[PDB]
Each structure stands twice: as structure tokens, then as C-alpha cells.
Write a protein that binds this ligand. Structure first.
Ligand SMILES: CCCCCCCCCCCCCCCCCC(=O)OC[C@H](COP(=O)(O)OCCN)OC(=O)CCCCCCCCCCCCC
Ligand SMILES: CCCCCCCCCCCCCCCCCC(=O)OC[C@H](COP(=O)(O)OCCN)OC(=O)CCCCCCCCCCCCC
Ligand SMILES: CC(C)CCC[C@@H](C)[C@H]1CC[C@H]2[C@@H]3CC=C4C[C@@H](O)CC[C@]4(C)[C@H]3CC[C@]12C
Ligand SMILES: CC(C)CCC[C@@H](C)[C@H]1CC[C@H]2[C@@H]3CC=C4C[C@@H](O)CC[C@]4(C)[C@H]3CC[C@]12C
Lengths: 393, 393
């Protein structure tokens, strides 16, 4: 198992997190100003919230993979000596989620003198970066180094060889593209919008902004920077393997992801300008959201998971062999990976007015939950079918 | 060891406790009224605070006894099958200390409608009793029943046989007599002082009370109800063993505890009345505090612990054999069991005006700490010397 101090730290951090969350809710109901816009803060903190949520669901995944015998230490090609058990991710999640609640609380109370209240997001997202690139061999240096060496083979896409960890993380970034949007919004807001002279700044004097629009191609390019990576990765895998079916057909789906965003952006620009030929684009976009919400779905079931098989037997649209104990799980996941998959690319085109933002903030933790369920059966099908194509035996 | 859920609960409760304590301090600095007396609440909550503190130091003791090999399962005559490890007392302490902080916080905010704010101490000290006398076999029913059957052989003193658990708890109640004083104050305050019509009540409209004085022979009788028990227990042990030295000389020390309290009470009554012959008592009291602060001290070292031995050897006023690893511990305890033991019976005679209360509240957690250090070497000397006189071999 794990030492008795690691479980103590897990519990301590989760308790502090719970109490600080309740205090956050109460202070937001009572101590709030209710006179200035709160969105320039909601986005900046929504990024980090999605990160913390993702780091806890990934701790639950590493427990489900071990209880069911998936052997994720050979698939990732990890080291069978030292690995992060679920209690080592439940611990980083809580630690980084304590500072998030502390920053969000200080941005409400501002319980200090002349120091401005816009330095708290900078402090939080500076500490979150310096926790990762600490050169001193402490606080999980082996894991952070294994992750830093690998976040470098992903962003420089076509110059390396694609292993399962590169593919897994590059596909994990597809459902985590809100972090990039909110990391771009922080920069464009701190650069040319927030007035440093005023002592409040983060909640500006209003109740009209220039960085959350689909602007001159810089919100759309960051929106699908996580599809460009996997497009090039599949093209490289085709260039190397020469098996033209799976890799080319696969890249043809991120290709569709490319068209939806550009057509939505074109329509948005044309109407915010007020051109007469705007509506012709709105008919095209709808075709790409219907085309690409299906392409990525009939691929999750038939090829990623491998469920709708012909020689199933008694399993009624599942595989011949299943690993997870029960059998209702495979049907709840099937019914969920269509409901949550339709809404996922609404939120990619949609990222319209202030009613078009309480939808993005609500659906953002539902694209990091759909990936949490993807990770469960992708790894299982990779274990007993080797369908990724990445292992000789 | 222990299951991985018990350590998680330990950590969770300690984290919630820490955060709620910091919130308590902040709300007492800021949200306070600063217009009404706060003592009628300080006493009522000081009782429960001492209880919670005692239940955590006793968890540390059960760890020190096991790491050093004291074998407290045979001395107490426990069951070698199921016993509370230190993590099962670290858990009850935190659980009961969460409700304490919640009650103390509600008494500050009063964050509910017409319901009065004096029902929170009643709620807390009703739940603390009903956690113990739950007939349903859940939430440590074996331990709570072993304790309830034994709190009955202690209060009915001379009709049972004195084992080590009876003596141990009856001597533990000597340094926990503030709980009884604050349980008597709660009753005499809720009975004839607090006006139920007013919605605040607990903080009365003032900045003159009739229940914390050394009153007509009730505060003093409850003050030394924990010395009467051990007096009778030693008399019974003499009646049975017929060895007249240790038991009679032992009872002769709680006899001295009896005289200090009555002389202090006589002096206090005579001066608050204003009699001319008051000061003659103040010379007697001082003789009993000097006589009885020495009697109980030269007994802790020579007979309870057994340190100042003649055949020590190289241990320089310790035993021939010592169990705890280091050797500075035995000297810090020697130097502490005189400093903290002089002040212990100041606080018994004292319990004088409002300057005579910030001393009792401050010294109350220093008589529950001096028993925390007693428990360490009493059990060790009982282990390797059998000096209690309670085991044939
Ligand atoms: C504005 C908002 C911006 C926020 C910026 C924040 C930057 C990043 C801060 C995140 C902190 C994450 C801490 C590091 C987590 C380490 C997890 C890890 O790598 O372990 C994964 C585990 C196997 O790791 P082992 O250590 O056992 O390997 C040992 C032998 N070499 O086995 C596994 O299952 C793999 C799990 C890997 C976790 C992947 C996390 C990816 C997160 C980085 C993406 C960031 C872009 C936004
Ligand atoms: C106004 C303020 C008033 C407050 C009123 C509150 C009333 C009491 C509420 C207290 C809750 C305490 C919960 C019970 C604690 C149980 C601890 C216990 O008994 O275990 C002690 C342990 C051995 O116990 P085992 O269960 O292993 O025995 C099994 C086989 N028969 O081995 C040990 O080392 C012994 C430890 C025993 C702890 C003794 C605690 C004594 C506290 C009661 C005194 C109360 C008077 C104020
Ligand atoms: C109708 C919809 C919304 C239902 C929601 C689907 C969710 C709750 C279902 C679908 C996938 C399921 C998971 C699939 C497999 C495992 C592995 C197992 O060892 C623990 C249960 C666990 C961890 C399941 C938890 C429940 C689960 C997450
Ligand atoms: C000068 C005075 C105030 C010093 C304070 C004395 C205190 C801190 C000393 C005296 C008795 C000591 C304890 C005696 C023995 C043990 C058992 C051992 O396995 C752990 C250390 C521990 C738990 C010690 C902790 C430190 C201790 C509590």
C-alpha cells in the first residue's frame, strides 16, 4: 500500500479543501460587492479549477486500473520501481486546490493593506508553474521530470516517435483546451485591459472589453492548437508505419475539428461586422457540428473502446471479454458518451453574449468528466486487444 | 497497524479542526460585540475544551507506551483482541472537537432565526453525553461500554475491589476537576441567572452574578469530590491488604487536599462578609498550600515514578533500568513536575476578582498537561517494578 503519513496528508488536505470551499460559497453570497462584473475573475480561476478537477479524476482512474488488473505500468512504459499510486495524485490535487481556494478568498476579502488585489492570480499561476520546474530533487522530482521531458515530445509534434504516452497526453489535451483559452485571456486582459493604477482592477468599474471575442484569429488559433498536435502525430505515424487505413482516417477527424472552428469564427466575425452575407455561414457550421460530432463519436465506440463487435456473444454490443466487474457500466458509458459528446463541440464553436458564458463555464467540467470515462475503457481495450498498434506482441 | 480509512478520518478531522480554529480566532477578533461580558461563555466552553485536549494527549500516551514496550494491555487487564490504538483516540478527539468549534462559532454568529443562542451549549453537552450512552452497538460500543461499567466502580468508591483501572481513572479525575466546576457552573447559571425571555442570554447585558463565588458549601464540595474518591479507595485497599504503610500514608495526602480547600473557603467567606478575624485564616491556608504541594510532589518522584533511588548507579537520581530511549526526558519531567505542581494547587484554592480568572483559564491546560507526563512514567514504573501492589508475580 502506502505509508501511513501519505494517507494522513490526503485526508488533511481534503478536509481543509472542504472547509475552505464552504467558506468561499458563504463569502461569495454575503461579502460580495454586487456592483461590478465578476467574469474577468471567473475565467482566470476557471482555468485552474479545471486543472485541479482533472488531477483528482486521474487519481480515481489509477485506482480503477489497478483494481481491475489493467497493467498501466507496461502500457505507458513506466518504471516498475517507483510510480505514483492513487494516493500520490489525491495529494497533489488537494495541495494545489488549497492555494486555489486561498487565492480566490483573498480576491474577495482583500485582507491586506495597499498591495493590489490583482496580484493573487499571478501569484497562484506562478507558484503552479514553479512547483513543476523546480530543479531541486524534492516534492516528486522523478514524476515531474518524467512529465516535463514528455510535454516536450508532444508540443514539437512531428520530430519524435509516437509512443503510447505521447498519444495519451496529446489526446488528453483535446478535452483540456479551456485551460489554454483562459491562459490566453489572462494575458490579453493583464496586458491591455486591466488598469494598474486602480487598486481593484480585477473587478472593473462597469456592469466594453476586447479579449473574449473571436478576435482577429487569435482566440481560434489557440482553440485548436490540441487538434493540430494530434493531426501531425497521426500523419507521422502514417509516414512511419505505411499502414494507411487507421492513421489517415484518424487524422481525418481532427481535420473536421479544424473546419467547425473556422466556420464559426467566420460567421461570428461577419455578423459582428454586420455583413449581409452572414447567414450562409450559419448553415455550413451546423453541417460541421453535425459531421464532426458524429465522426468523433462513431470512433470512440467502434475503434477507441471497441464495443459494437460482431462476435460479442451474450454481451449484447460489447466485447467478447470484459474486465470491469459489472455490466451496467458499459451501458451508462455508452449513453453518456453521446449526450456529453454532442455538447462538447457546441462549447468549442460557441466560446453570442453574456448568456453564452454561463453555458461554457457549466459545460467545462463536463468535458473533463467525459475524458475521465474515456480513460477507463481506452486503457482496457488497449490492454486486451492491443488496438493502439504500439506493441509488437 | 490500522486500516487506511482510519488514518484518512484522523487527517480529515484534524484539518477541519485547524481551519475552524483559525476561523474562530478571526471571528472573535472581528465579529465580536465588545460590549458584554464573555466569561459566562468562556467557562461553559472551557470545560469541553479541557475534555478534548485530554482525549488527544491520551492518544499520544498510548503511542509512547507501545513504542517503548510498556505492555499497557496487561496492566489495565484489557482484552488482547480489540483495543483502541492511538489512531482511534486521535479520531474521537477530533470528532468531538469539531462540534465544539461549530457550537462556539454559532454562539458568535448566531446565523439562524428566532431560535435562541443559549441552546448551543445545551446541544453540545447533550450530544457529548448521548455519544457515550448509545445502546445501539455502533461507534465503538465495546470501548464505551468498558468505560461506562468502570465509571460506576469509581463513583461508588468503597463497595468494589480496587484494580489498576479504577485507581488510574480515579487519579486521572484529580487533574480534571475543572470539568466538574464548569459543569456545576452551567447548571447554576442556566437555573437562576440566565433570563430565558431575552434572545441573547449567554452574553448578559452588563460589563452581578451569583454562581462562580466560593458559595454556601457547594463550589468547594464539588471542587474536591475527586479527592474523596481516592481517599476512600486507599482506605478500602488498607482494609483489605492490612499493609498499613503505603495505603494509609497515601490517603494522608488527599487528606491534606481536603484542608487547603476548606481553609481557603473559610477565609474567602470571612472576608467577603468583612469580618475582623479574617486574616488569621490566610496564614493557615498558606501553610496547607506549602504542606500539600510538597506532600503530593515528594510522592510523585519517590513513590509514583520511583526516581530518586539509592542503587541507581550511573543514572544519577534515576532507576537502575530505564525504558524510554533518551535520558534528558527524565530530567525535563523532574524539573516540570515541580514548576507545574506548585501552580496546580494555587488554582485549586484560587479557582479574588476578574484578574483571578485569566489565571485559572490559563493554568487549566497546564494541569491536564502535567498528568499527560505523569502517565508516561507511572505506567513504566508499574511495568518494571510492580510498585502499584496490584499483581502477584
Ligand atoms: C492558467 C492555468 C494554467 C495552469 C498551469 C499549470 C501547469 C502544470 C501544473 C500541474 C502539476 C502537475 C504535477 C505533476 C503531476 C505528475 C504526474 C505524473 O507524471 O505521474 C504520472 C504517473 C506516472 O508517473 P511516475 O512518476 O510514477 O513515473 C516515475 C518513473 N519515471 O502515471 C500517470 O497516470 C500519468 C498521469 C500524468 C498526469 C498528467 C498531468 C498533465 C498536466 C499537465 C498539462 C498542463 C497543460 C495545461
Ligand atoms: C461540561 C463538560 C462535560 C463533558 C461530559 C462528557 C462525558 C464523556 C464524553 C467522553 C467521550 C469519551 C469516549 C470514550 C472513550 C473510550 C476510550 C476507552 O475506553 O478506551 C480506552 C482504552 C481501552 O479501551 P478498549 O475498548 O480497547 O477496551 C476493549 C475491550 N473491552 O485504553 C486506554 O488507555 C484508556 C483510555 C480511557 C479514556 C478515558 C476517558 C475518560 C473520560 C471520561 C471522564 C468524564 C468525566 C468528566
Ligand atoms: C447516465 C450517466 C450520467 C451515468 C454516469 C456514468 C458514470 C457515473 C459511470 C460510467 C462509467 C463508470 C465507471 C466505469 C468503471 C469503473 C471501474 C470500477 O472498478 C469502479 C467503478 C467505475 C469507477 C465506474 C464509476 C461509475 C461510472 C463513472
Ligand atoms: C522544561 C519543560 C517545560 C519541558 C517540557 C517537558 C516535556 C515537553 C517532555 C517531558 C516528558 C517528555 C516525554 C517523555 C517520553 C516520551 C516517550 C517517547 O517515546 C516519545 C517522547 C516523549 C513523548 C516525551 C515528549 C517530551 C516530553 C513531553
Amino acid at each position: 500500500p502506502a505509508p501511513a503519513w501519505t494517507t494522513f496528508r490526503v485526508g488533511l488536505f481534503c478536509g481543509i479543501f472542504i472547509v475552505l470551499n464552504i467558506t468561499l460559497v458563504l463569502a461569495a453570497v454575503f461579502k460580495l460587492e454586487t456592483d461590478r462584473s465578476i467574469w474577468p475573475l471567473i475565467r482566470i480561476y476557471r482555468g485552474g479549477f479545471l486543472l485541479i478537477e482533472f488531477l483528482f479524476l486521474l487519481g480515481i482512474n489509477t485506482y480503477g486500473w489497478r483494481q481491475a488488473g489493467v497493467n498501466h505500468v507496461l502500457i505507458f512504459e513506466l518504471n516498475p520501481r517507483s510510480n505514483l499510486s492513487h494516493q500520490h495524485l489525491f495529494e497533489i490535487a488537494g495541495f494545489l486546490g488549497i492555494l486555489w481556494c486561498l487565492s480566490l478568498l483573498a480576491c474577495f476579502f482583500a485582507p491586506i493593506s495597499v498591495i493590489p488585489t490583482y496580484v493573487y492570480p499571478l501569484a497562484l499561476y506562478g507558484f503552479m508553474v514553479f512547483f513543476l520546474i523546480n530543479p531541486t530533487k524534492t516534492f516528486y522530482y522523478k514524476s515531474r521530470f518524467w512529465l516535463l521531458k514528455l510535454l516536450f515530445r508532444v508540443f514539437t509534434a512531428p520530430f519524435h516517435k509516437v509512443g503510447f504516452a505521447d498519444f495519451w497526453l496529446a489526446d488528453q489535451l483535446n478535452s483540456l483546451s479551456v485551460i489554454l483559452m483562459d491562459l490566453e485571456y489572462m494575458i490579453c486582459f493583464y496586458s491591455l485591459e486591466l488598469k494598474w493604477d486602480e487598486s481593484k482592477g480585477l473587478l472593473p468599474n462597469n456592469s466594453s472589453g476586447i479579449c473574449h471575442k473571436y478576435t482577429y484569429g487569435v482566440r481560434a488559433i489557440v482553440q485548436c492548437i490540441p487538434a493540430w498536435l494530434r493531426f501531425i502525430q497521426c500523419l507521422r505515424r502514417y509516414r512511419d508505419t505505411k499502414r494507411a487505413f487507421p492513421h489517415l482516417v484518424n487524422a481525418g477527424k481532427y481535420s473536421t475539428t479544424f473546419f467547425m472552428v473556422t466556420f464559426a469564427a467566420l460567421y461570428s466575425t461577419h455578423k459582428e461586422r454586420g455583413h449581409s452575407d452572414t447567414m450562409v455561414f450559419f448553415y455550413l457550421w451546423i453541417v460541421f457540428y453535425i459531421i464532426s460530432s458524429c465522426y468523433t463519436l462513431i470512433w470512440d465506440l467502434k475503434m477507441d473502446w471497441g464495443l459494437f463487435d460482431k462476435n460479442a456473444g451474450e454481451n449484447t454490443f460489447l466485447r467478447e471479454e470484459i474486465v470491469y466487474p459489472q455490466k451496467a457500466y458499459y451501458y451508462c458509458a455508452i449513453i453518456e458518451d453521446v449526450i456529453l459528446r454532442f455538447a462538447w463541440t457546441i462549447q468549442i464553436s460557441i466560446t453570442l453574449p453574456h448568456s453564452g458564458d454561463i453555458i461554457a463555464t457549466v459545460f467545462a467540467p463536463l468535458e473533463v468528466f467525459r475524458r475521465f470515462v474515456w480513460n477507463f475503457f481506452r486503457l482496457e481495450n488497449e490492454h486486451l486487444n492491443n488496438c493502439g498498434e504500439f506493441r509488437a506482441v
